[PDB]
Amino acid sequence: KQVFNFNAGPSALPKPALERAQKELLNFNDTQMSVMELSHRSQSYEEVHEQAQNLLRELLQIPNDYQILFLQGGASLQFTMLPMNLLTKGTIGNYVLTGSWSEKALKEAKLLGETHIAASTKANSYQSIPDFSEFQLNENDAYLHITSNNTIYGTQYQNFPEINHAPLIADMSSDILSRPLKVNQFGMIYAGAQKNLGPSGVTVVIVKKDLLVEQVPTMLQYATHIKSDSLYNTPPTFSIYMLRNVLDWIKDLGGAEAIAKQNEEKAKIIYDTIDESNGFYVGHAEKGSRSLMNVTFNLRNEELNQQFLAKAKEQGFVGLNGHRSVGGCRASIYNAVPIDACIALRELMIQFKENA
Amino acid sequence: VKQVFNFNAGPSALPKPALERAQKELLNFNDTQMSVMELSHRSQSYEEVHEQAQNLLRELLQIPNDYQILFLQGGASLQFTMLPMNLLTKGTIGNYVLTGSWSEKALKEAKLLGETHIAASTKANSYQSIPDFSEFQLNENDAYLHITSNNTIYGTQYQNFPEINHAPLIADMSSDILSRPLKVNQFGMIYAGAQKNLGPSGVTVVIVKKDLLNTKVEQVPTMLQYATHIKSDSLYNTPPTFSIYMLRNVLDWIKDLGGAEAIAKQNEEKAKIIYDTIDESNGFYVGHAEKGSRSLMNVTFNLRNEELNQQFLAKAKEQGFVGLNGHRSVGGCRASIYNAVPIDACIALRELMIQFKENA
Numbered sequence A: 001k002q003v004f005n006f007n008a009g010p011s012a013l014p015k016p017a018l019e020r021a022q023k024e025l026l027n028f029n030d031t032q033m034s035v036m037e038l039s040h041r042s043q044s045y046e047e048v049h050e051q052a053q054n055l056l057r058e059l060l061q062i063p064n065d066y067q068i069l070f071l072q073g074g075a076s077l078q079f080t081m082l083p084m085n086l087l088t089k090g091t092i093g094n095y096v097l098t099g100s101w102s103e104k105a106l107k108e109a110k111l112l113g114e115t116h117i118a119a120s121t122k123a124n125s126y127q128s129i130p131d132f133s134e135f136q137l138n139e140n141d142a143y144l145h146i147t148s149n150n151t152i153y154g155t156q157y158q159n160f161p162e163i164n165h166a167p168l169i170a171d172m173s174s175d176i177l178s179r180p181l182k183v184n185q186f187g188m189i190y191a192g193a194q195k196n197l198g199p200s201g202v203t204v205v206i207v208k209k210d211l212l213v214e215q216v217p218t219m220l221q222y223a224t225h226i227k228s229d230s231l232y233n234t235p236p237t238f239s240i241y242m243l244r245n246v247l248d249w250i251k252d253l254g255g256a257e258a259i260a261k262q263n264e265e266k267a268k269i270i271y272d273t274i275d276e277s278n279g280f281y282v283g284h285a286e287k288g289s290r291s292l293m294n295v296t297f298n299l300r301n302e303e304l305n306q307q308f309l310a311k312a313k314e315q316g317f318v319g320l321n322g323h324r325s326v327g328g329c330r331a332s333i334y335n336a337v338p339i340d341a342c343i344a345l346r347e348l349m350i351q352f353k354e355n356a
Numbered sequence B: 001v002k003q004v005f006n007f008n009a010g011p012s013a014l015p016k017p018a019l020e021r022a023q024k025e026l027l028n029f030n031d032t033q034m035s036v037m038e039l040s041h042r043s044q045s046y047e048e049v050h051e052q053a054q055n056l057l058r059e060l061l062q063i064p065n066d067y068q069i070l071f072l073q074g075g076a077s078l079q080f081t082m083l084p085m086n087l088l089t090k091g092t093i094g095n096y097v098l099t100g101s102w103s104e105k106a107l108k109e110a111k112l113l114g115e116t117h118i119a120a121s122t123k124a125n126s127y128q129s130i131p132d133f134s135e136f137q138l139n140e141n142d143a144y145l146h147i148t149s150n151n152t153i154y155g156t157q158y159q160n161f162p163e164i165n166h167a168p169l170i171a172d173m174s175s176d177i178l179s180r181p182l183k184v185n186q187f188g189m190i191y192a193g194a195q196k197n198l199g200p201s202g203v204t205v206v207i208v209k210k211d212l213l214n215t216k217v218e219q220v221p222t223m224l225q226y227a228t229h230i231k232s233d234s235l236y237n238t239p240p241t242f243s244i245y246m247l248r249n250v251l252d253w254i255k256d257l258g259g260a261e262a263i264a265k266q267n268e269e270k271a272k273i274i275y276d277t278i279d280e281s282n283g284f285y286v287g288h289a290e291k292g293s294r295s296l297m298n299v300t301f302n303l304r305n306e307e308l309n310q311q312f313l314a315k316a317k318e319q320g321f322v323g324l325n326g327h328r329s330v331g332g333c334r335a336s337i338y339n340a341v342p343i344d345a346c347i348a349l350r351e352l353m354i355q356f357k358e359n360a
C-alpha cells in the first residue's frame, strides 16, 4: 500500500493536519458541530479565521501595514482582479515572463489596459530567471508582476528585485511559505492554497493596505475584502480551517527556516540524482534557476520517458507526468511532500537507469 | 454531552451520514491512500466525484439535457455581478423583482454594469410577501428577469414561478434549492451558494441553459465568462475539490431519502411544527411573513418587544440552540430549517417556545 504523492496542485498535505481534521470532523471545539456546519459569523468560526491569518503573519513575519485576505476563485481570478484594481488609465501593467503562468497573468491584464514586458526568457523556453539588470521598467508602471516559482518549467527566483518606482507583485502559488520571505519587498503577493498551504478553494492574498475604486463590482474590489476582513460574503470555511491546520504543522516543525531546510534536502536528493546520472536524466532548468518546488526533467527520448513514468506509476508514485504543454516529468515537492518520498523516487530513478 | 440544535442560517447543518462518510475516508479515498483533498482534479478518482455530483443533481431536479451544471467559486455574491456581466448588454435592461435584502444586493451589482429596472417590489411593506405576478412591469428590452426564490433574511418564499417568455427568468435559489421539486425549464439560469441547503461553503451551483450563455462575451475576463466554465466543464482552473465532494455526499443522502419530492414532505412537516407554535401563541410570537408567503426554509418571528426577544434568544442559547438570532439587519429571530435540520430539533424548539411563553 505504498503511495508517493508528487501531485502538482492540489497536493500532499501534512498527515498531522489531516488526522486532526478527521478526529474533530463531527465535533469541532466541543460545539458538537462540524467546522463545516458553523455560521461564518459565529465566534467559533471567527477564531479559526483569525488564527489562520495570525499564523501566516507570524510565519512569514508580515508587517502591520500589510493585510491578509482569504478569497475564492484561485490564483486565476487574481490574474484579472489585480489589473482590475490597479491598472488605471494611463498606467501600464508590467510583466516579467518566466513561464506559462506568467503568460496567463499578462493575458488577463491585456483585457483591461496597457501592458508591457519588462523581461522574458520565453525565447529560450523559460530555462532561467532573467537578470534583474535587464528589466525594462516604465515611469507609469502600475505594478511590476513576476511569478516567483514557474510551476510548469521548474525554475524559481533565488531572490527578488529591488523595485521602487511601482509595487512589485508576485504570483507565489507554488512556493509561498516554502522559505523565509521579505514581505516588505512587495506591494502584493498571492497564492492558491492548494500547493503549499492547504486544500483547493481558498486563495491567500497578502496586500500592502494603503496600496489597494469607481465602477468595479463589489466582490472584485480588494477594498471590500480588506474592509470586511474577508468576511464580506461567506468564505470557504473548511478550506480556511484546513489552512490553519497546515500552518500549525509548519509552526510546529520550526517555521519557515525549518521548512526551507527540509525542502532544500528534498530538492538536493532529486537534482543530485539527475546530475550524477551521466545524462540519463536531464533537467530542464539552468542550474542557477533550479526550483526547489517543482523539479522538471526528461529521459534521453520519449519512449524512455514513457517507460519511466509507467514504471513510476506501477510503483505507487502519483503526479510525476510533466505538464501536457511541455511533457517530460515533473516531481512536485511542495512543503508536505516528505523526504522519504523523494528518497523513494531517487531509488526508483537509479534502478530504472541500471535496468534500461 | 448536552443537546445542540443547529439552526444556523448559512453554512448550516449537514446530514450526519455525509459527514460520517467524509470522516471515514478522509485519509484514504477510493483506496488511493490519499485524501480527496490531496488528489489532482484531473485524476480519475476526482473526475468521478465531479461527474457524480453533476449526475445526482440532474437526476434529483430532473434537469434537461440542454442545461449544464457548473460548480463555481465566489459564492452567490459573485453571481450577482457575473450574471449582468454576461447577459446585460448595451441597450438592454436587468429587470429585478425585489422580495428581500438579497434581491437588493443582486440589483445593486447590475446597476454597476448597465440599465436596470424593478418589475415589482414588496419593499414598501418590509418584504412580508411575494408580489402578485400580475404586477410585474416587464420591458421588451429586458436582458433577463431576476428573482430571489427564498428570501433568507425576511422568511418569505415563492410558492410557484412566473411564466416568462420575453426574457430569461433567472433565480437566486441559495436558500431553497433542492428543498422541493422544480421545473428547471422555466428558467434560463438558477444559482445557489451550496452552504445553505446543499453542503459546504466554497462552491456555488449554477444551472444554465447552455445556448443562452455558452458564447464568448467580448471584453469579459476569462474567469468571469460563463462560456469559460461551460467549455471546460468547471475545470478551467482548480476547483474546490473537497467542497464538491461534500456536495456529492449530500446529494447522495437526498437521493437516499427519496429525492426532492420526499424532502419537500419532510420540510413541510418541520415548518408546520414551528408555524403552528407561532399561530397558537395568541400573538406572543409574531411571524414576519404573510401567511401565503411563509418560507419553508427560514422562519422569521419577533416576540412582543426587544426585551423579550433578547431574553428568549439568551434562554435558547443556554438550552443548546444555535443560530436563532435574526439577521443583524432586521433583528428578531430566525429559525433556519433547511433540508438537513432534523425534525426533533424543530420539536425541541417548539417545546422551548411553549415553556418560554407559559413562563413569561
Ligand SMILES: *Cc1c(COP(=O)(O)O)cnc(C)c1O
Binding pocket: A009, A073, A074, A075, A076, A077, A101, A147, A149, A150, A151, A171, A172, A173, A174, A192, B237, B238
Ligand atoms: C497552479 C498555479 C496557478 C493556478 O491556480 P488556480 O488556483 O488553479 O487558479 C497560477 N499560478 C501558478 C504559479 C500556479 O502554479
Ligand SMILES: *Cc1c(COP(=O)(O)O)cnc(C)c1O
Binding pocket: A233, A234, B010, B074, B075, B076, B077, B078, B102, B148, B150, B151, B152, B172, B173, B174, B175, B193, B196
Ligand atoms: C446567503 C445568501 C447569499 C450570499 O451567498 P454567498 O455565498 O455568501 O455570496 C445570496 N443569496 C441568498 C438568497 C442568500 O441566502
Ligand SMILES: [Cl-]
Binding pocket: A098, A099, A100, A101, A102, A149, A150, A151, A152, A153
Ligand atoms: Cl510556469
Ligand SMILES: [Cl-]
Binding pocket: A008, A009, A151, A152, A323
Ligand atoms: Cl501547473
Ligand SMILES: [Cl-]
Binding pocket: B099, B100, B101, B102, B103, B150, B151, B152, B153, B154, B155
Ligand atoms: Cl432576503
Ligand SMILES: [Cl-]
Binding pocket: B009, B010, B152, B153, B327
Ligand atoms: Cl442570510
Ligand SMILES: [Mg+2]
Binding pocket: A248, A251, A252
Ligand atoms: Mg503548535
Ligand SMILES: [Mg+2]
Binding pocket: A272
Ligand atoms: Mg554531491
Ligand SMILES: [Mg+2]
Binding pocket: B252, B253, B255, B256
Ligand atoms: Mg444512494
Ligand SMILES: [Mg+2]
Binding pocket: B342, B344
Ligand atoms: Mg434525534
